[model samples]
Target: KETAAAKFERQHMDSSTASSSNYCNQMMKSRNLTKDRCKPVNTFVHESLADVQAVCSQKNVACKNGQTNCYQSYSTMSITDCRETGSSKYPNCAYKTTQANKHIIVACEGNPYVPVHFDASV
Candidate 1:
């Protein structure tokens, strides 16, 4: 069975070269995240899984859903956000590549040692 931590990485980690503008467009589909429905804005961190997991020890924050298990990374991390553009449709979801170095907030659970859900970025 895939652990929650690994599942989080599969859906949100992207360590490949992100120079191309269509990085998010291709990743969203390849990662199997767009099978049933389109995700509005999903972020992929271009950092090692260990580095991302260490964020649990960073600053504490509240998840968007009002949970307190979220942590914010102190340092800026490379990330690519796939946001639905105006031309986006259900089946053919179009997205705009937004690359940025921002602090990320993720939800932690279980042993309180790993991130389970992607909350948001600032």
Candidate 2:
């Protein structure tokens, strides 16, 4: 079974190329994230798997649900946020691309250390 951490990486991590205007449109489909439905708000991390995983021990933070399993990146990371526009609808959802350097918060777990879910960016 694919663990949540692995799924997170498959859906969110993309460090091979630079982010372009059509990044979301191409990636959302290519990564199989648009199969079932359009993800409302998603983020792509432009960093190495090792660098992202290292965030697990960077700094502790409280999750939106008040959990303590979330960690915040010490330094800003290159990221692109794919947000569905107001007029977006399933099967034809449109996204707004906004790229920035921000500290990311992720929910991590397991003995090997991995990001299970993206929490937020600040």
Candidate 3:
């Protein structure tokens, strides 16, 4: 069997879109998960930055327009304790999944004018 790194190289070599698509495929294969069996997880956002910081125990990342970054949960995303960065005007987050359920793509929107950096564990 090919390793994930090996598979990634093979797929990523062709096109950037292919890379994401292939990775998504590999993610589902590795996890033994698929759309048929896996339900999407929801993203949690806090109402305010102060509330989010208190729950996350971390400072919010600064996004564009001098807005504060809101917080989101990755692990099953079920928590009122999570906080929202003022930058995140929208309460809902977005996601995209691969065809085979190999991986999940998650996205959070902050101020388009503001830029924020996030570090999530894969």
Candidate 4:
């Protein structure tokens, strides 16, 4: 017999791609994104991207063209849809803040193997 709390803990312990960050880290590293770029804020991107692709890889959905903004949605456990789409000019992923210094945009695009901009402070 088990208590409610025990059951809850057990249920949450599944080893799916979403449950573990390992797959995300490995994918980024393999793509030459570097461990330094994979910070906590952005690590979720890598994790979610990989998880999304793992479930079902889509062209526009998997990885977009240029500067894409992702919003964190915990309840649905979805990959934050890009605020913007990628294009040939920016042809990668990037994020920026108006207040940030010099507006040094973080960008990554092209194949899923493209280097990701996962800097925490970026």
Give Cα-based local distance difference scores for all models.
0.86, 0.89, 0.28, 0.27
**TM-score of every prediction relative to native:** 0.91, 0.93, 0.21, 0.21
lDDT string for model 1 (1-122, tens) is: 98998889889987764546887678888987778888888899998888899999889998899989899999999998888778878777777888899999999887868998999989
Give candidate 2's whole-model lDDT.
0.89
Cα-based lDDT at residue 31, candidate 2: 80
Mark the regions of model 3 whose C-alpha exceeds 4 Å error after superposition: 1-18, 41-55, 59-122
Which window of ten consecutive residues has the lowest lDDT sum in model 1?
A: 15-24
Clash count, one per candidate: 0, 0, 9, 8
What C-alpha lDDT, on a 0 to 100 scale, does residue 17 get in candidate 1? 48
Per-residue lDDT of model 2, residues 27-122, tens digit only: 887887778999888999999989999999999999999999999999999999998878878887677888999999999999887899999999
The candidate that wins on lDDT is 2
lDDT of 4 by residue, 1-122 (tens): 85432332231211232323234334333433343443222233323334322322212222233434321222233221112213212223232211111111223333543223322222
* Model 3 per-residue lDDT tens digits across residues 5-108: 33322322222222232343344334333333331332222123333223233334433444444333323221111122233222232224322211111222
Q: How close is each model in CA RMSD to the real structure?
A: 1.5, 1.1, 17.4, 16.7
- Give the local distance difference test score of model 3: 0.28
